[PDB]
Amino acid sequence: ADYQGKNVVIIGLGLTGLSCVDFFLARGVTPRVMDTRMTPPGLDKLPEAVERHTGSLNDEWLMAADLIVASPGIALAHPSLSAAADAGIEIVGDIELFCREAQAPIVAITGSNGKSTVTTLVGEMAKAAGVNVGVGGNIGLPALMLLDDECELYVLELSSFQLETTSSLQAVAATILNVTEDHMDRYPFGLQQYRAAKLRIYENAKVCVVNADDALTMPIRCVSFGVNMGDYHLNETWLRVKGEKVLNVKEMKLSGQHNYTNALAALALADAAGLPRASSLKALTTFTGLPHRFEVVLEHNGVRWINDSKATNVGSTEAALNGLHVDGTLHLLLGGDGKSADFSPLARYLNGDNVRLYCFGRDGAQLAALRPEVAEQTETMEQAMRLLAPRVQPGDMVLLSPACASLDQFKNFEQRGNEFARLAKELGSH
């Protein structure tokens, strides 16, 4: 693709909007930028030479465009953007621009839960093998910042929003790990619309990796992973491939059944990508986990404080609660922007004499309502933590696994997690 002489418009700033801007500049094309936010991040880095429109979408700019590069953060359904598509104006995203330029195979990963883990694991498997690997997308660096001639493999986490605007992806290996309710504020046609966006990842993929335990991950053969069934399966616990033991999970630092199926998924994608199994299995024994993903930030005085701020949907929090072992009382922090999710699937894990709920953020009242008799509601996570702190006892667990976006009150789930760990360390020691 060649963009010279094109009127290009980018919707959305930040590092991703800026990576798009750099992409076009370096090609001898000056784009225009708009953001619906008044002072979006990165505005300051923008080279004065690029005109910008903030606080709203500029229809004059859009309708005059030859190409619109839409951040995953804006809906294709937005009236201004639907108008442009109706006019036949081409709309793509960063991932589409990347795929058109990429000169190395791409491993593509999406799903409601486990996608950052499996993306990171596959990158670790490549690294152990001596492969020059670029890992990013919806995790880490924006995809366009990974473009490098020396790169031998790319491993991208892709969100459903990125996939909606991508059409040139031809993955060497692609997976949807699972599909559980998320982003309903962005999918007015419900779960099947959301699933439809994720299913796009398989179009033109050399190998499709599917979850034998989750029919929604299926297209319409794929290599499969699952617990008791699949080409990659569990059998102490061993990872197996087609009946053959490959790894005793005692060698892994990660624990839990869901991280074991994450391990199969990664192995399946690495295998499809042609990485040696020895180095791939080795990476599985060295990977320690991501920050904010069920991360023990404090274990002091008989109490563990777990930062699971990366739990931004119901299915994620469920993966935290399902089979959880707590000696005393579980103090569960829930809260933020639920994205119109149905929280009732959590109810099942919240019976008993040993659970306390501390709910906050935009949807706090909705979360407290899962079990009002053991629930407390506050405006902030800080107020909730100071509320729960005096009550914690030896044998207790304090778990931040909010089931919601943090965007109503925090920059991102990382700042939420960082504030959690700060407070835990303050309230968790005399």
Ligand X SMILES: CCCCOc1ccc2cc(S(=O)(=O)N[C@@H](CCC(=O)O)C(=O)O)ccc2c1
Pick from 144, 194, 212: which is nearest to 1 by CA?
Answer: 144
58, 127, 138, 292: which is the annotated catalytic residue? 138
Q: Name which of 158 and 252 has its Cβ closer to ligand X.
A: 158
Residue 97 near residue 20 (C-beta atoms within 8 A): yes
Instruction: Establish whether 230 is an annotated binding residue.
Output: no
Is 411 known to sit in a ligand binding site? no
Angle between helix 115-128 and 257-273 (nearest 10): 50
Q: Is 237 helix (H, G, I), strand (E, B) or coil?
A: coil
Would you say 11 or 385 has its CB closer to ligand X? 11
d(CA 79, CA 146): 32
Is 117 a known ligand-binding residue? yes
Q: CB of residue 228 vs ligand X: minimum separation in angstroms?
A: 30
Nearest to 263 by CA among 242, 232, 292: 232
Give the Cβ contact number of residue 244 at 10 Å: 9
Distance separating alpha carbons of residues 45 and 139, to the nearest angstrom: 21
Does the annotation place 80 within a ligand binding site? no
Q: How far is the CB of 265 from ligand X (least distance, A)?
A: 20
Does 138 qualify as catalytic in the annotation?
A: yes
Amino acid found at 218: M
Helix or strand or coil: residue 54? Answer: strand
Q: How far is the CB of 159 from ligand X (least distance, A)?
A: 6
Residue 401 known to bind ligand: no
The reply, when asked if residue 113 is annotated as ligand binding, is yes
Q: How far is the CB of 218 from ligand X (least distance, A)?
A: 23
Question: Does residue 115 carry a catalytic annotation?
Answer: yes
Q: What is the smallest separation between the CB atom of 111 and ligand X, expressed in angstroms?
A: 12
Task: Count CA within 13 A, CB hemisphere, residue 237.
Answer: 18
Q: Find the radius of gyration of the CA atoms of the chain.
A: 22
Is there a binding annotation on residue 137?
Answer: no
Minimal distance in Å, beta carbon 237 to ligand X?
Answer: 30
Name the closest residue to ligand X (Cβ): 73
- Answer yes or no: are the C-beta atoms of 46 and 18 closer than 8 Å: yes
Which CA distances in Å does 87 have to 66, 84, 94, 147? 11, 5, 21, 32
Nearer to ligand X, 105 or 336 (CB): 336
Compare residues 9 and 397 and give the one whose CB is closer to ligand X. Answer: 9
Q: Which residues bind ligand X (CB under 6 A)?
A: 11-12, 35-36, 71, 73-74, 159, 183, 312, 339, 405-407, 412-413
In the bound complex, what is the minimum distance in angstroms from residue 336's beta carbon to ligand X?
7
**Residues 294/320, Cβ–Cβ less than 8 Å:** yes
Tell me the one-letter amino acid at 251.
E
Comparing CB distances to ligand X, the nearer of 73 and 105 is 73
User: What CA–CA distance (Å, rounded) separates 247 from 341?
Assistant: 37
Nearer to ligand X, 40 or 230 (CB): 40
Angstrom distances, CA of residue 102 to CA of 85, 171, 243, 258, 322: 26, 11, 36, 32, 40
Nearer to ligand X, 175 or 406 (CB): 406
Cα–Cα dist 219/135, whole Å: 25
Q: Which of 58, 127, 178, 183 is catalytic?
A: 183
Q: Tokens 């892994």 identify what position?
A: 252
SS3 at position 230: coil
Helix (H/G/I), strand (E/B), else coil: 194: helix
Q: Catalytic positions, please?
A: 115, 138, 183
Residue numbers belonging to the annotated binding site for ATP: 111-117
